From Swiss-Prot:
GO terms for molecular function: fatty acid binding; molecular carrier activity; retinal binding; retinoid binding; retinol binding. Keywords: Cytoplasm, Retinol-binding, Transport, Vitamin A. Belongs to the calycin superfamily. Fatty-acid binding protein (FABP) family. CDD domains: CRBP2. The lineage of its organism: Eukaryota, Metazoa, Chordata, Craniata, Vertebrata. Forms a beta-barrel structure that accommodates hydrophobic ligands in its interior. GO terms for cellular component: cytosol; nucleus. Disulfide bonds: none annotated. Gene3D superfamilies: 2.40.128.20. PROSITE patterns: FABP. This is Retinol-binding protein 2.
Length: 133
């Protein structure tokens, strides 16, 4: 299914530190953020996504329209501009973030009651799993 609406609570987080290191997130921030359980809130209406990813330390919001390239400013992350494009490959939501970093993007998809997220940068892959609230 393509319905990713809802509040999603993290069950699993694999190699988040490697992903952050590839983004050149500073040590203090990495070492706190790797500790944390995340929540994702997604509002999806047709093409239009509004997403909020939260932790006790820092949040990240990004909104986009599927199939419409946009300038993403990764504030609170590595603070870079990328040309972001989110599309559907089957039922997998695929984002490519064009810019300074090679192989940068993510893939997000539903399996049953869970949301899977794969974050890539350079040669690093972070895999996350969230359960629907
Ligand atoms: C790195 C980093 C963080 C960012 C998490 C990420 C990478 C969010 C990705 C959002 C996406 C892919 C939306 C579709 O779900 C948080 C704020 C948790 C803590 C501070 C350091």
């Amino acid at each position: 299914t393509r319905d990713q609406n809802g509040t999603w609570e993290m069950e699993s987080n694999e190699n988040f530190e490697g992903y952050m290191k590839a983004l050149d997130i500073d040590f203090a921030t990495r070492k706190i953020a790797v500790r944390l359980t995340q929540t994702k809130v997604i509002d999806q209406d047709g093409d239009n996504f509004k997403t909020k990813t939260t932790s006790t330390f820092r949040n990240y919001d990004v909104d986009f329209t599927v199939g419409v390239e946009f300038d993403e400013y990764t504030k609170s992350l590595d603070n870079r501009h990328v040309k972001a494009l989110v599309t559907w490959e089957g039922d997998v939501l695929v984002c490519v973030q064009k810019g300074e970093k090679e192989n940068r993007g993510w893939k997000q998809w539903i399996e049953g009651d869970k949301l899977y997220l794969e974050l890539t940068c350079g040669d690093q892959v972070c895999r996350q799993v969230f359960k629907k609230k």
